[PDB]
Structures are given as structure tokens and as C-alpha cells.
Amino acid sequence: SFPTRVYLLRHAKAAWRDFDRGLNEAGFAEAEIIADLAADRRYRPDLILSSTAARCRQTTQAWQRAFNIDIVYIDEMYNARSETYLSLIAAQTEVQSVMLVGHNPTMEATLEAMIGEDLLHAALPSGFPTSGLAVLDQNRWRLIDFLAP
Secondary structure (H helix, E strand, O other): OOOOOOEEEOOOOEEHHHOOOOOOHHHHHHHHHHHHHHHHHHHOOOEEOOEEEEEEEHEEEHHHHHHOEEEEHHHHHHHOOOOOHHHHHHOOOOOEEEEEOOOHHHHHHHHHHHHHHHHHHHHHOOOOOOOOHHHHOOOOOOEEEEEEE
16 A cells, blocks of 8 residues: 655745746745755655646655655646646555645645545645645545644
8 A cells, every 4th residue: 555655745935938937935935844844844755746837846856855865856746737746645555755846726726535525624724825735644644743834
């Protein structure tokens, strides 16, 4: 039964062709703060799957920094056809821990798919924030920690 740990990371705060928008200053700072919190709890993933969108790319570069991981870029994580990223997750049949780096609503929908709307609500009254990191473990997925700024 693999992955045994799922990390779900929303990209940091972007500034205002959408694909090419960057992380702004506060966006830059948060993703560092949160990346740092992570390797602190030792929340190191074997594989990172990220949007190719610059704002996801730069978000991911923060993590390489905190910890310097396998990383792959997938254009189809930007403006996804799917309501979730669940297939990216389960597909990785022999990788112990995996982290996805993409966007709302897909990111929020993925957590919802795994822990349900009621728990989603209790954990996040105002939804899935930028550079928010859900840490999930295994019949069913359990949320085990969440990082927000």
C-alpha cells in the first residue's frame, strides 16, 4: 500500500498570461517559512510533483533549498481537467512519500476527497491557503498535521 504519506502544498502567494505570474515578496517569504517548518518536522518527500506554472515552480524551489528530492513537472497540473489530483497520488505504487505542488480548487478538492467535507471544514474554516501544507497518513486517509502562515 504505497504512498504511505501524502503532502499537499498550495503554491505561495502570487502577484497579478496567468501561467507566467510570479511569487511576490510575501509569497516568497511564506513558502520559505513553511518549507523551513517542514524539514523541521522532517517532512521530507521522496518525490515532488508540481505544476509547471512559474508560481509553482518557485514555490518548489523553496523546498529544494530547505532540504538541499525527486521532482517532476507536469503542465497538466495547471488548469487541470480533473477535479482532483488523486490519480497522481495512487499511481506512484512504489514511492513511500509523495508531495503534490499545484492549485486551488483542485488542491482543496483533493484534500476533501481524502478526509471529507466535515473534517476539511473543522480544519480549515476559510479554505486551503497559499503555501498551506496538509500531511496525510494511512482503509482510509487520516490528516495528521497542517501548516499555514
